[PDB]
Amino acid sequence: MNLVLMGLPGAGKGTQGERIVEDYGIPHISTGDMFRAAMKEETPLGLEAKSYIDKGELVPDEVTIGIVKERLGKDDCERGFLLDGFPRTVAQAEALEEILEEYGKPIDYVINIEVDKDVLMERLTGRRICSVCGTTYHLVFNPPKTPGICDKDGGELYQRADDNEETVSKRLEVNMKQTQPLLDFYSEKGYLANVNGQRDIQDVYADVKDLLGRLK
Ligand SMILES: Nc1ncnc2c1ncn2[C@@H]1O[C@H](COP(=O)(O)OP(=O)(O)OP(=O)(O)OP(=O)(O)OP(=O)(O)OC[C@H]2O[C@@H](n3cnc4c(N)ncnc43)[C@H](O)[C@@H]2O)[C@@H](O)[C@H]1O
Ligand SMILES: [Mg+2]
Ligand SMILES: [Zn+2]
């Protein structure tokens, strides 16, 4: 199963992707997570990406395409994969098309998780992330069993650096500009499937499961 999840900041790509990987065992590849892991490990990649990430701007296509090409070439991906947050520009989509021919693994679906732009700020300012595994919670919409710690591993939950109001505004602006072009690109390819992500997590996942159940 070759999948791509797309959506505006805070729409719920990670929340739905974790559910997909637990049902299908494919690797969950999020470029955002890769960038934050790089920053945490203080690598050259982390240094390069941090500037854009802190501003809520897109990390340049070249370096981003490069780490995805490398990542998809790993053995854990020979049985399928779940891209999350990549591609997010038409240029990245065209590049992904080329890359997948190489690794002989064309896209089955590009799932677009649609949530009103006006309710995303609340999704992000109320978000808490696990410092250990990266899973996310929400103070109101999906709270951890115990405040301050992850259900799975007890790690401390914190607020992602770019989830501040100022940065979210830039993130929304930047990605909204990229949204129609990406939808048009995949609609034409026929890989696109829009899902209403502004409902309970389970209702959203049910619709997603429906789609994936159609693939061999
Ligand atoms: N390809 C690329 N090219 C260039 N630059 C790139 C790049 N990829 C990454 N970058 C750089 O990296 C930065 C960060 O990228 P990235 O980490 O990919 O940012 P993002 O796309 O904005 O997505 P988010 O992680 O913020 O949200 P999400 O959709 O996963 O939502 P979640 O499930 O956590 O949910 C959010 C909250 O909502 C809650 N929630 C989830 N579902 C629901 C629901 N159904 N109902 C109510 N609440 C819900 C959750 O509990 C949580 O609190 C970018 O800004 C850019 O600088
Ligand atoms: Mg995410
Ligand atoms: Zn955790």
Curated annotation (Swiss-Prot):
It catalyses: AMP + ATP = 2 ADP. GO terms for molecular function: adenylate kinase activity; ATP binding; nucleoside diphosphate kinase activity; zinc ion binding. Induction: By superoxide. Pfam families: ADK, ADK_lid. Keywords: ATP-binding, Cytoplasm, Kinase, Metal-binding, Nucleotide biosynthesis, Nucleotide-binding, Transferase, Zinc. Pathway: Purine metabolism; AMP biosynthesis via salvage pathway; AMP from ADP: step 1/1. Optimum temperature is 45 degrees Celsius. Thermal denaturation midpoint (Tm) is 47.6 degrees Celsius and is raised to 66.0 degrees Celsius when AK is complexed with the inhibitor Ap5A. It is an enzyme of class 2 (transferase). GO terms for biological process: AMP salvage; nucleoside diphosphate metabolic process; nucleoside monophosphate metabolic process. CDD domains: ADK (cd01428). Belongs to the adenylate kinase family. PANTHER family: NUCLEOTIDE KINASE (PTHR23359). This is Adenylate kinase. It comes from Bacillus subtilis (strain 168). The lineage of its organism: Bacteria, Bacillati, Bacillota, Bacilli, Bacillales. The gene is adk.
